[PDB]
Amino acid sequence: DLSASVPTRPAEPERKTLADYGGYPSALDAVKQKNDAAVAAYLENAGDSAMAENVRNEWLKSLGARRQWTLFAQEYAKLEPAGRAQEVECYADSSRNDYTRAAELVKNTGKLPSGCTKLLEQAAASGLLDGNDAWRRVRGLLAGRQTTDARNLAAALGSPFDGGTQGSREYALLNVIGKEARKSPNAAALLSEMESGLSLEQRSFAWGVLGHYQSQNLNVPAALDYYGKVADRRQLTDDQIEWYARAALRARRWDELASVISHMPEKLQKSPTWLYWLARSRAATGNTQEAEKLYKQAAATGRNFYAVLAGEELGRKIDTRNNVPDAGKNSVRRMAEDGAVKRALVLFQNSQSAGDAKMRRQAQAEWRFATRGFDEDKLLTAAQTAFDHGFYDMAVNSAERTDRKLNYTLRYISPFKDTVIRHAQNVNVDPAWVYGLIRQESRFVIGAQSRVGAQGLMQVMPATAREIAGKIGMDAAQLYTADGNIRMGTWYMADTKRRLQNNEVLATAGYNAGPGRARRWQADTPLEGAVYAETIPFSETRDYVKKVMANAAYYAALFGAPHIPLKQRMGIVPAR
Numbered sequence: 373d374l375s376a377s378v379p380t381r382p383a384e385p386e387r388k389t390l391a392d393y394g395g396y397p398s399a400l401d402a403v404k405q406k407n408d409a410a411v412a413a414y415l416e417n418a419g420d421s422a423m424a425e426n427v428r429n430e431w432l433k434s435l436g437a438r439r440q441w442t443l444f445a446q447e448y449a450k451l452e453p454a455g456r457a458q459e460v461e462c463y464a465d466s467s468r469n470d471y472t473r474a475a476e477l478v479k480n481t482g483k484l485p486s487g488c489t490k491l492l493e494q495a496a497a498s499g500l501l502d503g504n505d506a507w508r509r510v511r512g513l514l515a516g517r518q519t520t521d522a523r524n525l526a527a528a529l530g531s532p533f534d535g536g537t538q539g540s541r542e543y544a545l546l547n548v549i550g551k552e553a554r555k556s557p558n559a560a561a562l563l564s565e566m567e568s569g570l571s572l573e574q575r576s577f578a579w580g581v582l583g584h585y586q587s588q589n590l591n592v593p594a595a596l597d598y599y600g601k602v603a604d605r606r607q608l609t610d611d612q613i614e615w616y617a618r619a620a621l622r623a624r625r626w627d628e629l630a631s632v633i634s635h636m637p638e639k640l641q642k643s644p645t646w647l648y649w650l651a652r653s654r655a656a657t658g659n660t661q662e663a664e665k666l667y668k669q670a671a672a673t674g675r676n677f678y679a680v681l682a683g684e685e686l687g688r689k690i691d692t693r694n695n696v697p698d699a700g701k702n703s704v705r706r707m708a709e710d711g712a713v714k715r716a717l718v719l720f721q722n723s724q725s726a727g728d729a730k731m732r733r734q735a736q737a738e739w740r741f742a743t744r745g746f747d748e749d750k751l752l753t754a755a756q757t758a759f760d761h762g763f764y765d766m767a768v769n770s771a772e773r774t775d776r777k778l779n780y781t782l783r784y785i786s787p788f789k790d791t792v793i794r795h796a797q798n799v800n801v802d803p804a805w806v807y808g809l810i811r812q813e814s815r816f817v818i819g820a821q822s823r824v825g826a827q828g829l830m831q832v833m834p835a836t837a838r839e840i841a842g843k844i845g846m847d848a849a850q851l852y853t854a855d856g857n858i859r860m861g862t863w864y865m866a867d868t869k870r871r872l873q874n875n876e877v878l879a880t881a882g883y884n885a886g887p888g889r890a891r892r893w894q895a896d897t898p899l900e901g902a903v904y905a906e907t908i909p910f911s912e913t914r915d916y917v918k919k920v921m922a923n924a925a926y927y928a929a930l931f932g933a934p935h936i937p938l939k940q941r942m943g944i945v946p947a948r
């Protein structure tokens with residue numbers, strides 16, 4: 373059974389929730405304006421809410437930047453630890469001269485928030501950083517065009533870019549590893565020329581930069597040539613070493629793939645991606661028992677693309693039967709009386725009645741806040757509460773967070789079947805695939821709006837909507853209605869597929885990145901579908917295709933169509 377236990381945090385009246393929200397954007401503005409008195413006034417009588425936690429975190433980032441440490445410590449003491457932002461924890465630890473977090477943070481080779489960047493610079497200056505990892509970060513920052521941060525870290529390490537020592541040499545290497553320099557037809561030739569005067573670490577990193585650029589440009593032979601010159605693979609950034617694995621994968625070099633994976637950080641080796649591909653490599657080289665152990669490990673990672681593929685190699689088909697009962701209705705009712713859950717529901721229902729999309733986004737924040745500490749039974753109760761109130765994305769948000777207790781009908785909800793199934797049938801596309809795409813694009817939020825203006829359940833861009841409307845006799849603004857949105861998106865799935873050799877994997881990539889890109893990523897030979905997906909150069913699209921296709925496998929199982937293994941759904945991507 374599922375436990376009937378629900379939280380009973382103090383509830384506030386709707387009026388109070390709405391009054392607090394009325395002041396929430398101004399409180400964030402007051403942080404930006406450094407109006408500390410106004411922020412304090414907003415927080416003074418605030419409920420214990422995500423609104424308060426969000427304002428307090430943003431305030432603390434500003435207080436830490438401005439070195440107002442007494443006010444910082446006072447307010448930091450009011451945040452729950454699971455609620456403290458990364459940059460706020462870094463400012464707090466810096467204020468106590470505590471550099472414990474540095475050992476892990478320095479392994480990041482990309483841009484970090486200012487508080488965390490400064491924590492690492494302070495650790496460096498006190499000799500508290502691993503030298504190998506510190507200089508790897510300096511190199512990473514140079515390659516990612518974060519030159520100021522690179523410069524400041526090198527200085528803190530005691531070897532500044534103008535000091536004639538290590539720092540100056542790493543900076544000079546920009547003639548090879550720069551953003552544009554790495555693309556030069558002469559980059560490899562220039563690196564080969566200056567190589568004798570470079571350290572083992574600088575040479576390894578620099579070939580990794582060149583290999584990465586080729587690999588992401590899908591010049592696999594050149595990528596493997598340059599990556600083959602990396603003598604110390606642990607010097608590579610995470611993105612560089614994954615792109616070495618991707619090149620070996622694309623070339624079907626199973627032994628080289630297995631070798632590269634074994635040099636990855638443990639965190640990357642234990643990812644579903646590299647558990648599964650190492651398993652495939654062991655299988656391809658006749659190591660059946662090692663393959664099986666790895667497939668089991670990948671299948672244990674839950675509800676995702678590579679876990680399903682790994683299960684299939686083990687003879688396990690997807691199974692969407694729930695392994696827990698429905699939550700009891702009294703518990704579903706009483707969950708909505710918890711003060712933090714209620715607050716989220718108040719903001720959600722008022723966002724609907726009032727047509728306030730910003731309010732709806734804060735309602736999502738209240739939901740995540742309210743459910744943050746929940747055990748699996750409370751998550752599944754709360755998922756049904758959210759579904760009943762029409763808060764569909766939060767129903768999925770809570771249901772998908774479990775590990776052991778699995779409710780697939782709440783993980784893979786299918787509202788709007790009286791519209792989506794018909795539109796999908798009308799252009800002859802698989803409705804499980806459409807649902808899989810909607811779940812990834814909008815999580816069934818009908819008015820969803822991306823950072824760049826993609827709109828609605830299927831996240832069609834306005835420029836694309838205008839083009840589609842011109843082809844199928846619609847008006848462009850029907851993009852912003854549910855029924856028009858589903859008609860546009862399903863038609864565009866079918867049209868994009870028609871334009872990409874009728875292949876569903878290519879179509880999924882083309883829907884997100886444009887068909888011209890999807891076609892650019894094909895090879896001159898056929899590719900296994902999962903190999904095309906894993907070697908997509910755009911990180912967002914690569915993630916997107918795997919999620920949409922895993923989603924589609926789960927929906928197909930709930931919908932009861934004849935069984936299609938995910939491996940079969942991925943199939944073979946044709947040669948260009």
Ligand SMILES: CC(=O)N[C@@H]1[C@@H](O)[C@H](O[C@@H]2O[C@H](CO)[C@@H](O)[C@H](O)[C@H]2NC(C)=O)[C@@H](CO)O[C@H]1O
Pocket residue numbers: 826830831832833834836837839864882883884885886887888889890
């Ligand atoms: C669903 C949606 O709107 N998707 C957008 C993409 O398909 C869009 O790609 C661009 O779309 C146009 C229509 O096919 C093309 O004229 C344009 O060439 C195409 N880009 C190509 C082909 O490379 C991408 C961004 O380009 O964003 C999606 O959200």
